[PDB]
């Protein structure tokens, strides 16, 4: 078929010719080669597809037009906008209640593609009342009766409904969707668990009120369980949601610490995947930025040596998160805890990073060493620390920063040299 032929057929009076033309359009759109979505949009065929979506009499045309509109909305934002402007969102929401599962799930697919474009189309889909039907589909007493493919499609559409920011997902949709996500987190299918963890991650990435909403449901233990799964597609979003949660209040970080999350961090910090390592080190950093008892929990789990090792022998992107962990640890820790950090061998690997080209990280490192010097002052072992720093090559590297890398670093490095090394 050609675009002109399908245009003539879709506008024909025969319902059979209309169905044939819609089939040809769907086949052009589902043909793996670069679809001609732009041409089909310029043909004025989207309104005809939207009208077909309402033909309860003809299930084939409903399915074919929904498929074609799904494939059209899977492209650029302009094409998704063409679908949305054609009034496709209400039509798909109406189809959600279709007696045919294939059309209902094709509508779920299309609504997912639309809500994935951005936050505006997501808020529109929520505005036209798609949340409750979509969630009704999953509510079936036995979620196993709902085929794993259909359940995955529904979970993915819901994840897109919890995705994106500015504006953040509306409260009316989140208060509806969270319990279903709690239910789905207890399924045995990996592809559903990954999407559910990703949705929770989206929801926990923002104000502490949303983190508190997610926490008050009691799912943090199940997220910690998934944290130690063998499947990296599931571990990535779970580690990520936990890292987001630990960016909130001390009660929330204590919810995470109580769920036994720290027990998994020896494996995450020693993980081959560099992104897992970096995100776990960032989580450790935000945990060492908490109460003294939380830092003591980090120490009790024996994670300080692991941090020393990621600071000493890792990539720079993870070494920076290790530096942040060290700085927060020294900023909020007891004198005993800082003595422990030093006795674990943090001085040399921390100062061996002053040779980098990041003014920010250099200033943070210098703040850390200043905190350690303050602890020494409280202990009466300032000169011992000066000697140790000098012998580890520390004084040399702090002096090298007097080359006005930045006036900030110059004055910071000058302050230390005069206070303790002059």
């Amino acid at each position: 078929w050609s675009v002109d032929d399908i245009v003539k057929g879709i506008n024909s009076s025969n319902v059979e010719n209309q169905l044939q033309a819609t089939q040809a359009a769907r086949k052009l759109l589902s043909r793996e080669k670069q679809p001609p979505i732009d041409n089909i949009i310029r043909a004025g065929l989207i309104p005809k597809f939207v009208s077909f979506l309402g033909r309860t009499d003809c299930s084939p045309i409903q399915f074919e037009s929904a498929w074609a509109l799904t494939n059209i909305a899977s492209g650029t934002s302009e094409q998704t906008k063409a679908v949305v402007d054609g009034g496709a969102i209400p039509a798909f929401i109406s189809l959600l209640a279709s007696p045919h599962a294939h059309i209902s799930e094709q509508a779920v697919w299309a609504l997912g593609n639309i809500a994935g474009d951005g936050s505006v189309f997501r808020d529109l889909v929520i505005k036209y009342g798609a949340v409750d039907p979509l969630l009704a589909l999953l509510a079936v007493p036995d979620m196993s009766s709902l085929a794993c493919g259909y359940l995955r499609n529904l979970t993915w559409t819901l994840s897109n409904l919890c995705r994106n920011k500015n504006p953040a997902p509306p409260i009316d949709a989140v208060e509806q969707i969270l319990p279903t996500l709690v239910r789905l987190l207890h399924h045995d299918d990996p592809e559903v668990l990954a999407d559910t963890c990703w949705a929770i991650s989206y929801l926990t990435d923002g104000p502490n009120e949303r983190i508190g909403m997610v926490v008050k449901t009691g799912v943090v233990p199940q997220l910690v369980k998934l944290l130690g799964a063998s499947e990296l597609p599931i571990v990535t979003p779970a580690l990520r949601a936990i890292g987001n949660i630990v960016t909130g209040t001390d009660e929330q970080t204590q919810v995470v610490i109580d769920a036994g999350a720290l027990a998994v961090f020896p494996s995450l910090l020693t993980n081959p995947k560099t992104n897992i390592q970096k995100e776990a080190t960032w989580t450790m950093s935000n945990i060492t930025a908490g109460r003294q008892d939380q830092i003591q929990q980090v120490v009790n789990h024996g994670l300080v040596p692991f941090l020393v090792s990621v600071l000493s022998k890792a990539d720079f992107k993870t070494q920076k998160e290790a530096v942040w962990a060290v700085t927060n640890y020294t900023s909020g820790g007891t004198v005993e805890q800082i003595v422990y950090l030093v006795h674990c061998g943090i001085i040399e690997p921390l100062m061996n990073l002053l040779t980098a080209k990041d003014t920010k990280i250099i200033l943070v490192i210098l703040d850390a060493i200043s905190n350690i010097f303050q602890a020494a002052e409280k202990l009466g072992e300032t000169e011992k620390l000066s000697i140790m720093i000098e012998e580890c090559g520390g004084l040399d590297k702090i002096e090298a920063l007097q080359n006005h890398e930045n006036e900030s670093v110059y004055k910071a490095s000058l302050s230390l040299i005069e206070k303790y090394f002059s």
Binding site: G116, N160, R163, N286, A289
Partner: peptide
């Protein structure tokens, strides 16, 4: 010494799910 603030994340897209999907055959 005073406790430091918690650093909110920086979003990454290393293995994010697909924002849009296409049905094919």
């Amino acid at each position: 010494r005073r406790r430091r603030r918690k650093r909110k994340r920086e979003w990454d897209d290393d293995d994010d799910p697909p924002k849009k999907r296409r049905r094919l055959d």
